[PDB]
Amino acid sequence: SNAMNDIVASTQLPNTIKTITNDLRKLGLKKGMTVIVHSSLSSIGWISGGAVAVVEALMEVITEEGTIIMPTQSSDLSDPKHWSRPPVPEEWWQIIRDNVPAFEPHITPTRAMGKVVECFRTYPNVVRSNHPLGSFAAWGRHAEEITVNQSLSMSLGEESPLRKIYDLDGYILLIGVGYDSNTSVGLSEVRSGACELIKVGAPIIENGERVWKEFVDMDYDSDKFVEIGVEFEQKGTVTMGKIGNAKCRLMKQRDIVDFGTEWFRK
Amino acid sequence: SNAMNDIVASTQLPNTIKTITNDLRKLGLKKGMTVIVHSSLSSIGWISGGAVAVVEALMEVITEEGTIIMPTQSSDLSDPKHWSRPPVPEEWWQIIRDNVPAFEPHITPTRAMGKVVECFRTYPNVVRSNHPLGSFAAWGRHAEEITVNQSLSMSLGEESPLRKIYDLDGYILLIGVGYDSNTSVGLSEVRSGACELIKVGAPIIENGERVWKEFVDMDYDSDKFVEIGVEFEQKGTVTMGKIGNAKCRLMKQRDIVDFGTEWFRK
Ligand SMILES: CC(=O)SCCNC(=O)CCNC(=O)[C@H](O)C(C)(C)COP(=O)(O)OP(=O)(O)OC[C@H]1O[C@@H](n2cnc3c(N)ncnc32)[C@H](O)[C@@H]1OP(=O)(O)O
Ligand SMILES: CC(=O)SCCNC(=O)CCNC(=O)[C@H](O)C(C)(C)COP(=O)(O)OP(=O)(O)OC[C@H]1O[C@@H](n2cnc3c(N)ncnc32)[C@H](O)[C@@H]1OP(=O)(O)O
Numbered sequence: 229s230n231a232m233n234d235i236v237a238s239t240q241l242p243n244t245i246k247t248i249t250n251d252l253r254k255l256g257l258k259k260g261m262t263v264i265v266h267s268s269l270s271s272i273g274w275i276s277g278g279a280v281a282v283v284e285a286l287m288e289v290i291t292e293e294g295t296i297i298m299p300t301q302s303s304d305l306s307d308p309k310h311w312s313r314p315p316v317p318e319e320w321w322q323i324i325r326d327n328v329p330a331f332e333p334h335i336t337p338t339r340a341m342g343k344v345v346e347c348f349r350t351y352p353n354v355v356r357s358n359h360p361l362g363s364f365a366a367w368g369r370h371a372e373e374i375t376v377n378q379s380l381s382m383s384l385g386e387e388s389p390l391r392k393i394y395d396l397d398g399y400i401l402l403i404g405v406g407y408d409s410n411t412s413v414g415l416s417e418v419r420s421g422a423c424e425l426i427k428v429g430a431p432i433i434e435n436g437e438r439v440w441k442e443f444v445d446m447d448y449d450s451d452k453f454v455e456i457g458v459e460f461e462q463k464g465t466v467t468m469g470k471i472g473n474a475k476c477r478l479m480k481q482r483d484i485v486d487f488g489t490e491w492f493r494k
Numbered sequence: 495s496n497a498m499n500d501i502v503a504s505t506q507l508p509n510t511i512k513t514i515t516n517d518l519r520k521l522g523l524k525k526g527m528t529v530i531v532h533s534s535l536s537s538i539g540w541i542s543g544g545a546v547a548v549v550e551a552l553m554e555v556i557t558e559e560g561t562i563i564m565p566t567q568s569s570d571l572s573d574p575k576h577w578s579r580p581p582v583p584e585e586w587w588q589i590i591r592d593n594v595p596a597f598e599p600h601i602t603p604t605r606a607m608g609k610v611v612e613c614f615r616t617y618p619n620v621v622r623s624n625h626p627l628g629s630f631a632a633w634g635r636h637a638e639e640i641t642v643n644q645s646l647s648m649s650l651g652e653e654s655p656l657r658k659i660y661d662l663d664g665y666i667l668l669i670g671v672g673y674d675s676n677t678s679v680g681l682s683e684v685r686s687g688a689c690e691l692i693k694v695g696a697p698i699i700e701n702g703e704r705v706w707k708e709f710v711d712m713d714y715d716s717d718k719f720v721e722i723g724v725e726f727e728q729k730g731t732v733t734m735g736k737i738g739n740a741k742c743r744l745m746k747q748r749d750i751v752d753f754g755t756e757w758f759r760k
């Protein structure tokens with residue numbers, strides 16, 4: 229439950245930066261690590277400091293000489309034709325394309341990324357990549373290298389932060405979330421050459437001016453991510469432990485990405 | 495049916511930066527005004543761009559020659575002895591005092607202020623006061639003057655951003671919320687001696703270190719404000735109108751504050 233008395237009731241003693249730091253280290257997070265993090269704050273139990281405590285815990289373990297990455301997706305900038313949660317009437321679609329504010333990395337909020345991401349993306353020295361729908365944010369040693377020159381088309385492909393993490397043999401940390409939140413599997417979708425290309429649209433700043441920009445991407449499908457996860461855990465290497473009440477998973481990104489790639493091909 | 499689904503169903507046509515701007519001007523908002531704003535995003539009906547659209551619209555009307563203020567309270571940094579929404583076990587109280595992260599204006603999230611406020615406070619050039627519980631954020635001409643040197647004790651009193659708005663002869667804008675959100679009437683409580691005083695605490699950064707700090711504030715009571723609002727409205731100086739579906743009010747802060755002060759003494 230997300231109701232606060234349920235969250236408090238689910239906890240024996242407060243989670244603090246210190247208890248979270250200790251839990252992260254026991255799980256295997258280390259100084260210098262490159263790690264992309266996916267989370268649910270409520271899954272942990274009651275935390276003194278809320279999202280701030282988790283971000284500060286992560287930074288305390290990883291440090292400046294490591295790199296933290298988080299997806300900072302902004303799907304409400306997408307073309308409303310495809311919307312289902314909820315869908316909007318068809319008479320709104322062109323109004324939306326004409327009026328939805330352009331992606332601006334320092335301004336545009338994330339949607340369905342979680343409070344930990346909203347907190348993290350506003351930290352000083354956090355760098356955001358340039359994609360109106362599928363951006364990422366990063367902090368630490370490789371933050372610039374990982375976020376720079378993201379392509380508009382194939383947002384999760386070979387010219388994405390996912391590929392840069394892959395190149396650096398980075399880790400994926402899932403905090404109280406499952407494989408449907410594992411963005412890195414999108415890179416397996418692209419490399420499989422299986423899933424379908426679709427025409428997508430989003431508002432960007434182009435020539436110092438708002439344009440509704442059309443481009444090409446994959447119709448990424450998170451349901452096959454969960455299937456991959458189930459199989460990956462029966463076969464591949466993944467570490468599991470708890471942060472407060474959250475069941476967490478830590479894994480090498482290259483292991484899951486390569487497994488996913490072969491899975492999609494069959 | 496999900497919150498969002500009902501929001502869409504109660505909207506005939508999408509709210510945009512342009513329709514919100516147009517509605518704001520229609521209501522009476524003008525270039526160069528000093529205005530403190532309180533809002534519910536969902537009350538407007540469906541907005542293309544959500545919180546961003548509302549902030550941008552306010553900025554387009556007021557301009558940098560005016561000033562926008564919003565409360566940015568972070569009450570989850572306070573001494574848990576006083577918590578009721580929700581309370582936590584007493585065994586936790588010292589742990590929390592020892593571990594809750596210190597307020598840092600560019601980082602600490604708000605509680606119960608709304609997505610509009612969360613968007614506004616991290617927007618570029620927006621400035622936030624120093625108070626660890628009762629801070630305010632501002633943008634524009636008097637942003638720095640309004641937010642500088644807020645006293646630790648009596649966070650809503652004669653040295654708070656509320657007094658500075660008062661001296662500037664500013665306005666209050668309520669967007670789909672009632673008098674119980676009208677923070678400025680806290681100033682009336684302070685001046686009349688209405689509400690009770692309490693020992694509170696919070697953590698700050700002082701001389702480079704996290705210090706848990708004790709101080710005095712008033713136990714501000716929102717319920718009183720609604721009765722006051724009723725009576726002050728009868729007196730005829732509140733402009734009312736809609737922004738999308740939101741019932742909005744625009745009034746002079748001096749006028750409501752002076753009325754509330756009188757209201758409490760008698
Ligand atoms: C394939 C892809 O690429 S998908 C893109 C990748 N996506 C992700 O990484 C998302 C991963 N996270 C998730 O999927 C999550 O399930 C989410 C974010 C959708 C929802 O998780 P939640 O825990 O409900 O939300 P979130 O993490 O934002 O936390 C806010 C909640 O924390 C709780 N909370 C508030 N304060 C505290 C505190 N001090 N301590 C503990 N919990 C708290 C509240 O319940 C709050 O819920 P509310 O806003 O309804 O009141
Ligand atoms: C006296 C004092 O000092 S009290 C302190 C002063 N307080 C304030 O000024 C805050 C005033 N506002 C309120 O009190 C409000 O009632 C709140 C903010 C407490 C509740 O209002 P809400 O409309 O529920 O929340 P909020 O304004 O944050 O908007 C977020 C909601 O908008 C809705 N929403 C999201 N996107 C959109 C969109 N594009 N268009 C329209 N609505 C949307 C969602 O349902 C979201 O709810 P969720 O986050 O639970 O999914």
Ligand SMILES: [Cl-]
Nearest residue numbers: 261262397398
């Ligand atoms: Cl590493």
Ligand SMILES: [Cl-]
Nearest residue numbers: 382385386387
């Ligand atoms: Cl690619």
Ligand SMILES: [Cl-]
Nearest residue numbers: 271404474475
């Ligand atoms: Cl869990």
Ligand SMILES: [Cl-]
Nearest residue numbers: 594595596704
């Ligand atoms: Cl601290």
Ligand SMILES: [Mg+2]
Nearest residue numbers: 334349350351
């Ligand atoms: Mg920023």
